[PDB]
Amino acid sequence: PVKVFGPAMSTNVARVTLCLEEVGAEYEVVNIDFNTMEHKSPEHLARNPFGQIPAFQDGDLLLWESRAISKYVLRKYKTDEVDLLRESNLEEAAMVDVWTEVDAHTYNPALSPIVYQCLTNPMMRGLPTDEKVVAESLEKLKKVLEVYEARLSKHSYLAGDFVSFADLNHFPYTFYFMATPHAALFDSYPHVKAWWDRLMARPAVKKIAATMV
Amino acid sequence: PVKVFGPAMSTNVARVTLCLEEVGAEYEVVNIDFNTMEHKSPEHLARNPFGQIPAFQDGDLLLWESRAISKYVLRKYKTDEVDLLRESNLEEAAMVDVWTEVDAHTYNPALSPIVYQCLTNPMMRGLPTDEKVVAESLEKLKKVLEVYEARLSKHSYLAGDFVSFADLNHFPYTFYFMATPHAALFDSYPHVKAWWDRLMARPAVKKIAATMV
Ligand SMILES: N[C@@H](CCC(=O)N[C@@H](CS)C(=O)NCC(=O)O)C(=O)O
Ligand SMILES: N[C@@H](CCC(=O)N[C@@H](CS)C(=O)NCC(=O)O)C(=O)O
């Protein structure tokens, strides 16, 4: 098998987790304890020089950074009935690259603060939640989902009329947003709600969402 | 040719600019004025729905997000004497993916604040610079370049013993860091200084660094 280092709870781990469950590869999730500073430990720095989760072992190959790990997985285990990067078609490719990078640079940075603040703060590491920061991040996110509604009224998926890495990347952080009080926000954006429910009801996503409780 | 929308001054534009000058493709840089809010204008939203620079036109193909644009360019114009993504070798590939994503998630976020604050603030948009934020970002960056020195003592480039996209990604923001008072920081990190000067003295980089003044 291949080894994935981090808690399953973790969103950046779920990212990699899912990409394996979509490509029906055999894998083990070796946990890492944050309370024990296991991720700063010397065993882990031999995987990730920056001592963050997740990392990845394929025999004598050692990989960090959830999106580089995911590409690598998807390229390696490419069936004809599962090409979620579309490297054959150069233009389909570009439109997975573009919505992969909307998640990392536009969507996640507007959404991730509402989770952390409404959820990681109180549930983990029990500090309070900042009205100032949740309120701002919502407005920021409302005007971002205006573009998603537009795109997801023309296409069934961000990339085109097919599931891609770009769809999957949006799964882990969005899944935790769905447990905040503000999860009814997506109701107001029906074509995005539609695309959500389409993702939620894949077999692979149905599995991994087990591993997030 | 192909059209790249944004000021050449711009770092995310330089990213795309360079990738074309490395692959000897024919291109025009159509400018966009920030003072006139040209990037929020309706012509531009037809390129980038989020009304940020840069965007990209290859005939009837419209692309945003400097790193997705760059992949697309590099894949498209792939000679045998210029494969800066290494998609043939799956493992070389992964090690361009990993250091591409170190720039976006670890390096840039520690370095970009020292530029913006020491340079964009006073030079552009004339507000002051925050000691609190420059001081912190340096410490953050010193412990990041400790990993770069280690990696660049084993290999000549981040990826392996070859120039890659991962090397190029580090160019634009680092080039502006080189004009702050703190540019002598890299002196303390000789193998990184070495790798810098190796990049600085390519023909393509020698051109694009013209287009950043
Ligand atoms: N953005 C990176 C890293 C994600 C990340 O930093 N993970 C967190 C999980 S809570 C972590 O390890 N934080 C602890 C630390 O960075 O010290 C990726 O692509 O995986
Ligand atoms: N990170 C994105 C976008 C970079 C970006 O946001 N560019 C700036 C250049 S100053 C911009 O357009 N800022 C104005 C705005 O976003 O409103 C990429 O991969 O190109």
Numbering used by the authors:
A (entry chain AAA), B (entry chain AAA): 3 to 215
Could you give the paper's own sentences about this structure?
Recombinant AmGSTF1 has been shown to exhibit both glutathione-S-transferase activity toward xenobiotics, as well as acting as a GPOX, reducing fatty-acid hydroperoxides to less reactive monohydroxy derivatives.
In spite of extensive crystallisation and soaking efforts, no crystal with any substrate bound or any alternative crystal packing forms of the wild-type protein were obtained. Based on a careful analysis of the crystal packing, the key hydrophobic contact stabilising a crystallographic dimer interface shown in Fig. 1b was identified and three protein variants were designed to facilitate alternative packing. However, the previously disordered loops in wild-type AmGSTF1 were now well-defined in the Phe112Thr variant and, for the first time, a glutathione molecule was determined as being bound in the G-site, confirming the validity of the design strategy. The Phe122Tyr variant therefore adopted the closed conformation for the two loops over the binding cleft with glutathione bound in the G-site.
